[PDB]
Structures are given as structure tokens and as C-alpha cells.
Amino acid sequence: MKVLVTGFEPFGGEKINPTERIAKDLDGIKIGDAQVFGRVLPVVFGKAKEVLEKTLEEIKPDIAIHVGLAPGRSAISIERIAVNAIDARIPDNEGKKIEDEPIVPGAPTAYFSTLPIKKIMKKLHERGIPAYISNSAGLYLSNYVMYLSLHHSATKGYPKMSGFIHVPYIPEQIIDKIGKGQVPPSMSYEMQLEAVKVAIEVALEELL
Amino acid sequence: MKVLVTGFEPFGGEKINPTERIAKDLDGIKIGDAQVFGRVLPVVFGKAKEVLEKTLEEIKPDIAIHVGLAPGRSAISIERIAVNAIDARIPDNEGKKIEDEPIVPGAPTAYFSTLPIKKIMKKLHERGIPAYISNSAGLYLSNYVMYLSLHHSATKGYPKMSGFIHVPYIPEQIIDKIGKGQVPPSMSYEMQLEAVKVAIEVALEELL
Amino acid sequence: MKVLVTGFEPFGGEKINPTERIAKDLDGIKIGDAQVFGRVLPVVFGKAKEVLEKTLEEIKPDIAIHVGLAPGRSAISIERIAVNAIDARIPDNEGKKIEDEPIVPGAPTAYFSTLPIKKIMKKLHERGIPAYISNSAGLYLSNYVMYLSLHHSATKGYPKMSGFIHVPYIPEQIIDKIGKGQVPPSMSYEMQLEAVKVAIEVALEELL
Amino acid sequence: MKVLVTGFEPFGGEKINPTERIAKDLDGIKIGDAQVFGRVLPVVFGKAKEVLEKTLEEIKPDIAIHVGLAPGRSAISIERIAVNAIDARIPDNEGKKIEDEPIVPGAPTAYFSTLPIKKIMKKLHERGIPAYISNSAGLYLSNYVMYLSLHHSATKGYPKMSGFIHVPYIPEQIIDKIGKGQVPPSMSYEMQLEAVKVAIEVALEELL
Fold first, then answer.
1. Chain A closest CA to D105's CA: distance in Å?
2. Are C137 and C145 contacting, i.e. CB atoms less than 8 angstroms apart?
3. CATH value at residue B81
4. Given D132, D178, D191, which is nearest C171 (Cβ)?
5. Domain count of chain B?
6. Domain range spanning residue C141?
7. Residues in chain D within 8 Å Cβ distance of A177
8. How far apart are CA D97 and CA D140, in angstroms?
9. E runs forming strands in chain A
């Protein structure tokens, strides 16, 4: 068994992206006889697609779990659907702002996550980790990779399972926000890392 | 040096109140040569006043830090002011619902917290703990005790410092909320307990 | 030219549904040489499908604009995508609660709205009406009808344009909410009705 | 009978302040045998105090209702208390940023609004206008004037009634916010103006 976990670099002014640590922290660990690979993707259209495709092609994971930062969200959110579209509210890390454009022309309008999202959520609740199902991963880079991953799956037959998980800001990221007159929700890094491992575990239990 | 920390029992349907554990967890510990006392107050008008008065009178703390649950708040909030009024949106744990009534007739309309609130907040930020200054502790039991405590201070000369701190829901309390179609902010119990100790420490450093 | 506008009856305990009045208010009016038909759909799975199919089949509209109540949303929201799924958080008006089930088995995972959503939004802004693009209409009845409508469109060739618009609570609906300790956003009925007419107009300008 | 209504000029980057129109719109009108005076105050510490004091001294109102913009609030909010403190998160329109400073040294920590706030709220509800009681008017200019007004009242014996009312953004102000990736609540200008007249009316009915 091989599992691929990806995270994203900082973006939109944020100095950190909790998903970057998550990916690095999970890279190389083993859960049962399953080997986990952690890779950090750039918040850049195009380049991110290349890194993703090469990684999937090089590792050929059975399961692919992509994690991203969802500023403002109060709990762990498991994405149910990836849509074939890009409409960036802000530019990516290269300065490009793509608006109303398909990710893969002619490809399906959308793909359902193949991760056992309800069991993952239920398992997190048992661990006392707030989590829910999101029906939109935005139309920025998180959705971008989530879509490409599921498309690769429907196209090449692997990974067997692919999905996306969004995590809230970690506490320390809230500090400089307070000054700007507003305090968004946060979740400790430990609970976030824990949530992803749980997701991997439930995914492994399910996959075959 | 003697420090008094209070918490509240569950209320409003909640099965737990993180401040109850905090009080019990801090009871009996020593921070430097300072003895900390932890007491859980009932979410009941009148009865809560008696317990508070007796405790203050029995222990005669130099510092009094009262902690409560603020459902919906996303970070640690340090109260700046206690108002001489009661206007309960819901009844207390005894079924009574007091509306537009003074706490202490003839007493001052309000009292400023005597805790070094700005330093406490600043110290929490350094620890990476989101925190801010709240200018209203509500008009329920949190405000009730905060007011009575500061009134006891202005009246008897002790404690020298008195204030109130509100904490968010802890993660596990969010689980059953998700079903009811809504996910409020939360903060891990560990960070909450930590925040209170920090507050105590900064208070001790300040007090004399 | 024929335009079909639908609304929903009250649901989830709400005594009113602003979209019901909207539909009734727009029924029978003419915008240019375009005849508008307003119909109120029941917040009931299955039954709602029948009413929708019959209405579309009987009127055979060139444009179909379905409106619904989105409790909590602060401005007019134009839906970008309808997904082939049902996962009701609450039961419908008949007491049934469908979870994780497709709307049309074997049908596409999702459909993009064919209404000129960006122009509609832009036109509303010019009128000073807050509006934005929503990328998820929920998985309750709004999404249900939005999907069925676009599926009917891809299947029968009509209507040429189909989409969904969610409106906030109208002010009067907020009154009894205040007691329950919370005040959600609202938008006056007049602005809501106005927004829908604008949408119809932009749709007509676009359609051919 | 004489009633004084004040509003504020634009501030914090906002190009408009709905309270400015409200004041101008109500200036000179008569409600029964009561003469209403509408004055716009500058969002400037010090200068605002002078304008307020001169106005109160020149008109010597029986009732003083001060209105302000509360960005983000979803309904009409009637302030219950004014605190003797300034802690500006942002500078005023002259560039000054006052932090942790009393408004009137030696004066009471706080003043309760003398307007019949509960009746005003109840009357607005009957009109279908969402409204609630706020227990904090912030520590910026709204609180500043609210305090000074009630202090003038306790000091000079007039006005007999003084209070503050905060209104949400009006719809048009939300338009350019949408771009910045966020849509706060709003309330039509008409409902806002209406709410203030109601407040004046209830105040008149009450005052003597």
C-alpha cells in the first residue's frame, strides 16, 4: 500500500501554510504496511499540475489525500466534489489570475471524491475532532489539484481513492489578524495532523 | 500570594463546561510561591453570589480570575468591564430568568477589570494564543460574578486584582452541533488551560 | 419568449418563504414581449420533481429561473453549479430525509448554470444590489430542482437557459430569531423581487 | 418638545455613512408637536466633543438620539451602556489614534442609556424591523459621543433622555466589499430611517 499526502506552500500574504508541515510531517512514515509519501505543492496554476502529475506518475499511489488551508473555516472539512473550473478571486503565487476557465477542456463538469468521506468524518467525531462535509472546495488551487487528481484517477485507473481535506487556520496565524480588527476560527496543528492520519487510516481500511 | 480561579458548571443544555475542568485542574497548584485555589461556581443567580462571597471571604485572595464559557467566540477573550445589570436571555440552572435588574442596587453602573488585561493579551500572543479584549461579558452569570468580584474588591479592599476571561467551546463540544446544521469556533482544552496559567502569571508579575 | 420563475413554500419551521411571494408576484407579468410564469414548488422530494417536470413540459419555457431561500446568506447569490446528489440535513415537508443518494442515476455528476451569471451579478451591482456567485446550492431541494431543470434542458433541449438564485431572509423573518439569541442577515423583499426581475431581463437580453 | 438626532460623516475608508443622510433627512421635521434637529458630527476625537457640547447647549434637547454605523452588524442595535474609555483600533479622521484613555477623567466608569430601549426594540419588531440590545458601542467615536451625551445629561440635567443606535451597512456599501472576498450584512436605508423615527416616537411617548 502506498499513500500520497500533499500540502500547499504559503499564499495570499500568509507567512505559513499548516498543510506544508502536515505533508512534511507525514512524509516517510508507515501506517501498518502502508508507505506514506508527503509532498508540498506550489500555489501556482500550471506548475502545480506538473508537480502533481509527475508525483502521481512516479509514486503511483493507491490513495491520494490532498490537504489545503481554508481561511475562515472552523473545523476539518472533507470535500465531496471537485469542479472543472477556475475562477481565482486572487492571483496565484506567480501573479496570474485565471477567471472562468475549465481545468481540463472537454473533461467532466465534476468528480465526486472517492475517499470514504462519511466514515472519515464519523471517525474524526469519535476522536472528538470537529469535521463536516464541504460541497465546494472553492475554484482556486485546492479545487484545481483535487480535480486533476480525480481526473488522473478516472483516466489512468490510479489512485483508487482520491479526495481533498481543508483545515482551518492554526492558532498562531490568528495573532496578526486580531490587529486588523477581526478574529477568525482556528484549530491546533496537532489536531490537524491527527485528523489527516485518521483520514489515511480510514482510507486504508476501506481501500480493499 | 494567593490566587483564586473559578469556573462554571454546565449550562444551557451543554453537557460540559471547559471552565469546570480548568478550575479543578488549577486547584492546589503553585506558581512560584503563589498558591492557587480553584472553585467551580453554579450557573445560578443568588446561589452563585453566596458561593463567591464565602470563597473570597474564606480565602481572601490577592488575585481573582473568573473564567467562563462564551459559546461562539473564536479566541480567548479578556473582559475589560463588568456592568451592574442582569438581563438573562435564557434562565439559569434553577429555572429563573432575571430581566433588566441591577446586581447591587445603588452600586456603580460598572467596574473596570483590575487585571493587567493588555499585558495578559500580549503575553498570550507571544505564546501563539489568539486573544483579544472584550468590552462586554454579557449580562448573564459571567458578568454577574465578574461584577460582584470587583465590587467586593472596591468594598473590602481585596482582592487587589479581579477580572474575567471567556474561553471558546472546546472541540469535542462542537460534534453534536454539526448535526444541528452549524459549526461554531473552538479551541483545544490544553490551550485554554495554558492561557489561564499565563494570565495568572502575568497577574502575579504585575501584582506588586 | 417565455420565462418560468419558481419559488418554494415555507419549510424547516419557517412560517414564510420570500420566494413564494416572488413567484406569485412575477406570475403573469410581461417584460418586453416576454411572458413570465410564476409557480410555487413544494419543499418535498419526488413531488417537487413531478410539479417541475409537468410545468416545464406544459409551458416549455425558453428560460427557467428557480429561486430559493438560503437562511443565513447576506446577499443575493447566483448558483454556478448543480450536483447530482441528495444529502438532506433535515427532512422535507413530507418528513422524508434522503441521505447520499443520486438525483438521476447514471446522469452527469454536475451541470453548470446556463444563465449568464456573471452579467446578472454585474447588473445587480450597478443597481446597488449586493450579489455574488455561489458554488454550491446545498444538497436539499434548491439543488434538487436546479439539477432536474438543467437535466431537462440537456435532455429535451429546453429551456435554453436554466439556473438558480438564492435570496436571504427578509427582515420580518428575523424578528423571532432574535429571541433565540442570534440575528442572521436579511434583505428587504422589494430588493429581492427587483433582483429576480433584473436576472430575468439580463437573461432575456442574453438568450438570443 | 425638542429632539436632537446626530449622525456621523464617512470614516475608515467608507465613502458614505448612512447616518449622515438619516440626520439630514430628519432635520427640521416635526413628529407631533415635537421639533426634530438633525446634526452630522465629525469622526474626530475632541472636535466631535465640541460640536456635541455646543449643539446640546444651543438646542437644549429633551431627547438626544445619536446614530452611528456599525460595520458588520446585521440588524438595528440599541446601545444599553456607554463606557468612560477610548481605545481606537483605527485612527479618527484627523489621523489620531487614542489608546486606553478615559473620556472624562474622574467621571463614572459608565452610564446606562436613558432611552426606553426595550420599548423601542419591541416597537421595531412590531414594524417588522430586526433589532436587538447591544451591550457595547465599541470604544471609538460612537461610544465617545454616547458617553459625553449621557454625561452632559447627568451633569446639566438635560437632555432628559439620551441614547445611541447603531445601524448596519446599507446595501450599496456592500458592492465594493464583494470584490475583496467577503459580503457583510446590510439593511436598506429606508428601514434604517424608519427605525430612527420609531425610536424618536417611542422616546416621545415615554418622555413625560
1. 27
2. no
3. 3.40.630.20
4. D191
5. 1
6. 1-208
7. none
8. 10
9. 2-8, 30-31, 34-41, 63-69, 76-79, 81-83, 110-112, 131-134, 161-167
